[PDB]
mmCIF file of C-alpha atoms in Angstrom:
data_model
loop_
_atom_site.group_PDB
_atom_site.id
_atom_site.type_symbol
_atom_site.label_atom_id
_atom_site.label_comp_id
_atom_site.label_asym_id
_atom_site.label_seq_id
_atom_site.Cartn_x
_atom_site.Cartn_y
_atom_site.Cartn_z
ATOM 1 C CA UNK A 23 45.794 85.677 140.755
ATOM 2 C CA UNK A 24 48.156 87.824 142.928
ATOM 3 C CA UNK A 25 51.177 86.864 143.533
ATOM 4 C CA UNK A 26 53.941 85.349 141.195
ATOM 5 C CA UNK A 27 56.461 87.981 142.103
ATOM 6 C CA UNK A 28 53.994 90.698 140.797
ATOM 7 C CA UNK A 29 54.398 89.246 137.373
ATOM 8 C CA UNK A 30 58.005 89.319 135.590
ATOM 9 C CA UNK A 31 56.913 86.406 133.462
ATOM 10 C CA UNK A 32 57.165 84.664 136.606
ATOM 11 C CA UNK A 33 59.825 86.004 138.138
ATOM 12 C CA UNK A 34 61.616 82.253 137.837
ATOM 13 C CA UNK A 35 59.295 80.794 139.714
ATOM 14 C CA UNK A 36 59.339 84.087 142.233
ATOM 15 C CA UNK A 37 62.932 83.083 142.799
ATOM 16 C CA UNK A 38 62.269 79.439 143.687
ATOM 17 C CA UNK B 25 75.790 54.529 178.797
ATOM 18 C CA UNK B 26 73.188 57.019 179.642
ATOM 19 C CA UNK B 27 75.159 60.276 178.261
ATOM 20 C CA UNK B 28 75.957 57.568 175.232
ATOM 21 C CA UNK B 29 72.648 57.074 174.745
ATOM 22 C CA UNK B 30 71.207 60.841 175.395
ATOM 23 C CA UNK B 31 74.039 61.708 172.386
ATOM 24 C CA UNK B 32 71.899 59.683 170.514
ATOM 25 C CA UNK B 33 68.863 61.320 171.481
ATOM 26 C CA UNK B 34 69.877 64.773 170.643
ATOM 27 C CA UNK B 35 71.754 63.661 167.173
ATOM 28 C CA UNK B 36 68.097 62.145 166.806
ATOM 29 C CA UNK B 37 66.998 65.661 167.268
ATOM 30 C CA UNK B 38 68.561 67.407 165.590
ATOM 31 C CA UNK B 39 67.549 65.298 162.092
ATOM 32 C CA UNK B 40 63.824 65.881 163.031
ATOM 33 C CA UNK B 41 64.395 69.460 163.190
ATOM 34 C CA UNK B 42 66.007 69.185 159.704
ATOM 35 C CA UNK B 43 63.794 67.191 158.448
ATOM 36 C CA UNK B 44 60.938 69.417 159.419
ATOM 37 C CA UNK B 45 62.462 72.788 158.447
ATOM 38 C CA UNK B 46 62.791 70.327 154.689
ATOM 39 C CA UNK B 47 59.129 69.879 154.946
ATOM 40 C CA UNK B 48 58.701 73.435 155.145
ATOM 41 C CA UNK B 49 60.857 74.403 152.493
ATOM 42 C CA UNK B 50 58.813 71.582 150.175
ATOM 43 C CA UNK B 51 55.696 72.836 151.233
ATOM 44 C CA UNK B 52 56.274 76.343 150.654
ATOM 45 C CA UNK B 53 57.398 75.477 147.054
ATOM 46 C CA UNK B 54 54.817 73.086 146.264
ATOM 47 C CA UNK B 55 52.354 75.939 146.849
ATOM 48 C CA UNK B 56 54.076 77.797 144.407
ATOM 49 C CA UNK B 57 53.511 74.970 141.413
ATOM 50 C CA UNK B 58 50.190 75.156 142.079
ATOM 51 C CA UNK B 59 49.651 79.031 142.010
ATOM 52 C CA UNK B 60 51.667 77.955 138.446
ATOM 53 C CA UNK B 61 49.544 75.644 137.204
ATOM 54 C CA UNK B 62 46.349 77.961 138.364
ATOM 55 C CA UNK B 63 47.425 81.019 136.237
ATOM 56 C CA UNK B 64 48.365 79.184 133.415
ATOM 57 C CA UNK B 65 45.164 77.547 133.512
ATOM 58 C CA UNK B 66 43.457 81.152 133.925
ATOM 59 C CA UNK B 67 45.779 82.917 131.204
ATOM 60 C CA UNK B 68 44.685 80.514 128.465
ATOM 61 C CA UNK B 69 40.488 79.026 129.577
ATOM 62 C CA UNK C 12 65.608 59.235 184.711
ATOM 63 C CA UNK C 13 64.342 56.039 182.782
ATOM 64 C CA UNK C 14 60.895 57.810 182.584
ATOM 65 C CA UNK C 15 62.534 60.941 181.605
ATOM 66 C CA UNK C 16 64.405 59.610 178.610
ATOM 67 C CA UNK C 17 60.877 57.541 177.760
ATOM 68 C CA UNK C 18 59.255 60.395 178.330
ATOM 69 C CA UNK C 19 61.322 61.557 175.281
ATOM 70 C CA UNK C 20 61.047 58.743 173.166
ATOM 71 C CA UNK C 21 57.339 59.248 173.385
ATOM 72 C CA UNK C 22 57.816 63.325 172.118
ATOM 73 C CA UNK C 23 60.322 62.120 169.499
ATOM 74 C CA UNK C 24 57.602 58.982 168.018
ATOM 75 C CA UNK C 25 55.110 61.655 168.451
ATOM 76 C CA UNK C 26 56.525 64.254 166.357
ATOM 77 C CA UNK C 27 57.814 61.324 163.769
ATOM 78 C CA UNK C 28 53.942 60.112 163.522
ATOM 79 C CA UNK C 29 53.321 63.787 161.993
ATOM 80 C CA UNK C 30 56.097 63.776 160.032
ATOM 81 C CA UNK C 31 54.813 61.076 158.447
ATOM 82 C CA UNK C 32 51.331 62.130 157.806
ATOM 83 C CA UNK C 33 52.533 65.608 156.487
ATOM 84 C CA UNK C 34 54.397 63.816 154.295
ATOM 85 C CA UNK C 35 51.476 61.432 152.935
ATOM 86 C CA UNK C 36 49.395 64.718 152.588
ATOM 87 C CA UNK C 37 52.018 66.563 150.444
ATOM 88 C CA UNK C 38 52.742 63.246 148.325
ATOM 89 C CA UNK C 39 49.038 63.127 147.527
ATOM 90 C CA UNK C 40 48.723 67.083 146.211
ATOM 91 C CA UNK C 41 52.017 66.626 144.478
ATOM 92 C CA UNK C 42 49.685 63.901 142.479
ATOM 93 C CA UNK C 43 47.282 66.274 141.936
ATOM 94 C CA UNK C 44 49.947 69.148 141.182
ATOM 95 C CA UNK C 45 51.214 66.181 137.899
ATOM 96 C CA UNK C 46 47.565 65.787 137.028
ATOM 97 C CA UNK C 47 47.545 69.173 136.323
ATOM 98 C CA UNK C 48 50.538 69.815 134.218
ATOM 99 C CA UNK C 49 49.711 66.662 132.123
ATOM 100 C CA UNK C 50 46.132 67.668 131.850
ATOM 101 C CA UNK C 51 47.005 71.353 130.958
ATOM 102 C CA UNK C 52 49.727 69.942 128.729
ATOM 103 C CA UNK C 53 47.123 67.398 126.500
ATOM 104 C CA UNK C 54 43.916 69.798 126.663
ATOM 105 C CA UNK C 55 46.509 71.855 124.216
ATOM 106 C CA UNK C 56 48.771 69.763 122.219
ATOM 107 C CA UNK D 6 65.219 47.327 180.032
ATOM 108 C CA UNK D 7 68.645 49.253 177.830
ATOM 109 C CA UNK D 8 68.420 46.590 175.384
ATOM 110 C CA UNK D 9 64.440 47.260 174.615
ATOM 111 C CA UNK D 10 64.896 51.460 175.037
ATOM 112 C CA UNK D 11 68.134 50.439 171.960
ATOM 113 C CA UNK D 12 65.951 48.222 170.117
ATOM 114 C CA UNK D 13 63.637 51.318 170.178
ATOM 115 C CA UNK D 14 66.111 53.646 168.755
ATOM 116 C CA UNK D 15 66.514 51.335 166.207
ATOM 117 C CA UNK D 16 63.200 51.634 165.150
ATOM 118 C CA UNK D 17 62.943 55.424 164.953
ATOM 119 C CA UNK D 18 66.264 55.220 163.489
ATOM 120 C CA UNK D 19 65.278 52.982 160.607
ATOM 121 C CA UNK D 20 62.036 55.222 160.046
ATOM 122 C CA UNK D 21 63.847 58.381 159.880
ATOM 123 C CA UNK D 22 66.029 57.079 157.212
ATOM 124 C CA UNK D 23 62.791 55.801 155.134
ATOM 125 C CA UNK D 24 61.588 59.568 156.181
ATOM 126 C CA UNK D 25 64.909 61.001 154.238
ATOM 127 C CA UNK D 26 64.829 58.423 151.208
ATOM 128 C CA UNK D 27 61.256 59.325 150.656
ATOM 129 C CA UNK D 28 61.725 63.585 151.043
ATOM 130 C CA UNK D 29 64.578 63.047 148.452
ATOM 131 C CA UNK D 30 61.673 61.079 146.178
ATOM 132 C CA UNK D 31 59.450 63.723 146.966
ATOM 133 C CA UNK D 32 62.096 66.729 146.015
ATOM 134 C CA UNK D 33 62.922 65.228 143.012
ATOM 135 C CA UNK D 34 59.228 64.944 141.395
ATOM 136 C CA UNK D 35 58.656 68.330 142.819
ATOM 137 C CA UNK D 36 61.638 69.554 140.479
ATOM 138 C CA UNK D 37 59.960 67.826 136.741
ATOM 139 C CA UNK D 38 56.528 69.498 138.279
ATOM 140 C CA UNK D 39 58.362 72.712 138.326
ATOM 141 C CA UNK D 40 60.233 72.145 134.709
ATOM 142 C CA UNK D 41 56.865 71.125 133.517
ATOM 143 C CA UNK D 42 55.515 73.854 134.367
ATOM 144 C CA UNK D 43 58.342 76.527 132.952
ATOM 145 C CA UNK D 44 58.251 74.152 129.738
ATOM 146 C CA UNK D 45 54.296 75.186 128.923
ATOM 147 C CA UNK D 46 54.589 78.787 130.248
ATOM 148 C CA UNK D 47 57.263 79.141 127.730
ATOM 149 C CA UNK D 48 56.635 76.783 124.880
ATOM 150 C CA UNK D 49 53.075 79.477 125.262
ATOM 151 C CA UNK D 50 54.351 82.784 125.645
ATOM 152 C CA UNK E 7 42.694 62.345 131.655
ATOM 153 C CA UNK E 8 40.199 60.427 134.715
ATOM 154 C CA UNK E 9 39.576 62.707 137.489
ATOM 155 C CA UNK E 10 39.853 66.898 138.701
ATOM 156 C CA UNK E 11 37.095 66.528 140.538
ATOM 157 C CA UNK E 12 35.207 65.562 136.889
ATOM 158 C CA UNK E 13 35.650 68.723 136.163
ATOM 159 C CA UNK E 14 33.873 71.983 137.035
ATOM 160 C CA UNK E 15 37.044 74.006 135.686
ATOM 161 C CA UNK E 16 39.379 72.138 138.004
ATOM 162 C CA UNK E 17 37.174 72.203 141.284
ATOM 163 C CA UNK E 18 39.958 75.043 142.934
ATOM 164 C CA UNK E 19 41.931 71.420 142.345
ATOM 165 C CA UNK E 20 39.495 68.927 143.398
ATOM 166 C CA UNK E 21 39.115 71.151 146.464
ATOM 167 C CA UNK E 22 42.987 70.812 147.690
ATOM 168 C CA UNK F 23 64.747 73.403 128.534
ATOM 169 C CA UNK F 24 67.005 71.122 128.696
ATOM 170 C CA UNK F 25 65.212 67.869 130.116
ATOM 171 C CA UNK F 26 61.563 65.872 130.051
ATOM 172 C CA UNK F 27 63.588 62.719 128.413
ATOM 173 C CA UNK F 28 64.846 64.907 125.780
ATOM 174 C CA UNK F 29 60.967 65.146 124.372
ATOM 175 C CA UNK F 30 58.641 62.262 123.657
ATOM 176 C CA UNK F 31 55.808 64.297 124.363
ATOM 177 C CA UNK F 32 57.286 64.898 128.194
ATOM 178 C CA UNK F 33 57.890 61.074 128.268
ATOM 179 C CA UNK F 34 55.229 60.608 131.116
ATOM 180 C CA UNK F 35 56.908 62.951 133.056
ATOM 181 C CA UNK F 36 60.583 61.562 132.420
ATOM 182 C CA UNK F 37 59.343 58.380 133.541
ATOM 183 C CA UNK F 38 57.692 59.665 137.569
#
């Protein structure tokens, strides 16, 4: 659900 | 032999503290595998 | 200053005792986290 | 009574350093759950 | 395979 | 990428 950097394909893992 | 042994104490110390901010630091990123493994369970069921 | 420094030792277990426990805890969802990613993994190969 | 508060040390000593060797264990699965988990996001998308 | 909570969609993973 | 035991079906997880 929310979170994940706000999406980005994952933002890498929302930067580690 | 008692500051010898406090030196000890506080090099002990100062590990835990490591070791703890570590645990942190692991924690924090393990709940980021499983907010992974959630969406890509929601994205595809 | 015997009891002092025992006093500390007793803190210092203390704190090590939850170290320990956190660490069982995080081991076990980390399981859980692989069960997961294999069971994702097979339900779509 | 500095022999038994050393032999002590020992102790904690000896369990922080099974502490470390097993947060290094821990790190390292954590890292395959998190290439696991880029691997099926991508080998999907 | 064995286990999830035996199932329910992954039991919010078998509760934590 | 680069990784899982080069393949093998993820190789049990490289081997734990």
């Amino acid at each position: 659900x929310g979170x994940x950097x706000x999406x980005x394909x994952x933002x890498x893992x929302x930067x580690x | 032999r008692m500051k010898q042994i406090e030196d000890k104490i506080e090099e002990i110390e100062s590990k835990q503290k490591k070791i703890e901010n570590e645990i942190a630091r692991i924690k924090k990123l393990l709940q980021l595998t499983v907010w992974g493994i959630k969406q890509l369970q929601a994205r595809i069921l």
